[PDB]
């Protein structure tokens, strides 16, 4: 009767302890998202096993084999029974698997070196000096591109056509061209993340300006599955118990580094 | 016939009365964010629909004695409303006894004053006399600190609890209304996207301070096994991802305020 919870490997929402060579089973994790499942677990009743998505992927679906990835596919193919992550609820993934109601709020924000001239996206629109660019994939580019605003329009516009490239192949590698490039560079990312970076050594990057959009990270369930029920309960409970700001606060400054 | 009955509250800007609404008839007598929102969703749900205000005006709460809810929440689950399109908190009672979509909008507990007091924070109320600050009698609001763990604001309830004269209010303008009149010796907590609406009305005597205080989300509701709920959820998400969602935001908030 274990439930089988597939989960990403992103701080602070689920990381390695310092010593999980010694430890196994769920032992072995702690963060946000570990903390959240235990919560969850406790409140729907009953027992589970956390394991990390076999290719590390949040979930986006092939155009050419239309075959779905990461925890999404785990839970649409019947690998995992629920995905606890920060997994944000889109229109595509809402069609092929079911999410609870959120249980953390963001949106799209701007991630600087401290010292840069920047404090809008409309800063950034109207200058070329300070380059800027998202990830080659995900909610977020997707956002400028199809995006009928002209600040964004143009934001994308420049994006499009940038030499040398302004895209990044993942986050990690976004967030470390912004401290590498001297104050020349702004990455655009989901505000949780960047008010987390923002928070750890050597702490030279923070956050400007309001979110661009709003989404949402939802605890998935295969679609049609009786657990989703209890799941999405469980989340409003805890959030009007200010459980998932304590969470938050937690993770994010409580054992932060600045 | 095959027309929705769309329940909805009258709460600016959401839903409000057009300028000739004597001289109109049906869903073009209203309009405002869910009005237009509304629309939407019918549009990409394809269905005619019929927009109509709830009796007793209210949103939903279950008598304690009675065990019978009111507002929009009691129209759905006694068949009454095929769809409640309004600012809805989505809570956990609620979602008890009905459907909700996915949240269209995100708001918290803010912190409304008059133009000039000397506050910035929640914690800054706590700390002091000189300023009243209370809410709604009745509500998530006052529900919050009652059952709150942090310090500041279960400080703040032992301070509004005992209280005299009262610091509760019955009614959302009437917060705002003594907040206008205090002289800035009163402050008033409410949902931020009111408070937000608020600072864009004359006389723009009052502005939103600090950061919210909690997390909610207000979304469209509709009665268990429904077989509008699924298409209307998805109808949410999609409009989000178009910005439409937001383009609704700006327009009834700051593209028609007057400050
Ligand atoms: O569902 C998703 N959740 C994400 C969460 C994060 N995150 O910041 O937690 C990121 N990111 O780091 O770029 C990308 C994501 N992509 C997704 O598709
Ligand atoms: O579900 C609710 N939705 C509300 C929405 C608003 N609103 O701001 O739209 C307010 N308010 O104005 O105080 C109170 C509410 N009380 C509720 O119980």
Redesign the interface.
Known sequence: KTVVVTTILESPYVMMKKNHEMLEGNERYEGYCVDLAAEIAKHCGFKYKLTIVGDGKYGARDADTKIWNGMVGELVYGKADIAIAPLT???VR??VID?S??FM?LGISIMIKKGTPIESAEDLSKQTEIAYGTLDSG?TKEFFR????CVFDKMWTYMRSAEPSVFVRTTAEGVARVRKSKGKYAYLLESTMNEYIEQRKPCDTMKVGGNL??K?Y?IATPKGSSLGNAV??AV??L????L???LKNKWWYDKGEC
Not at 146 to 149: G, L, M, W
Not at 239 to 242: C, F, L, M, R, S
Request: hydrophobic share 20%; glycine share 10%; net charge neutral.
């Open positions: 609820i889109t229109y809402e069609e999410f109601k959120p709020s909610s199809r995006s009928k605003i959009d709003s949402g939802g999405n309960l409003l409970k959030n009007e118990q200010g998932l700001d304590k």
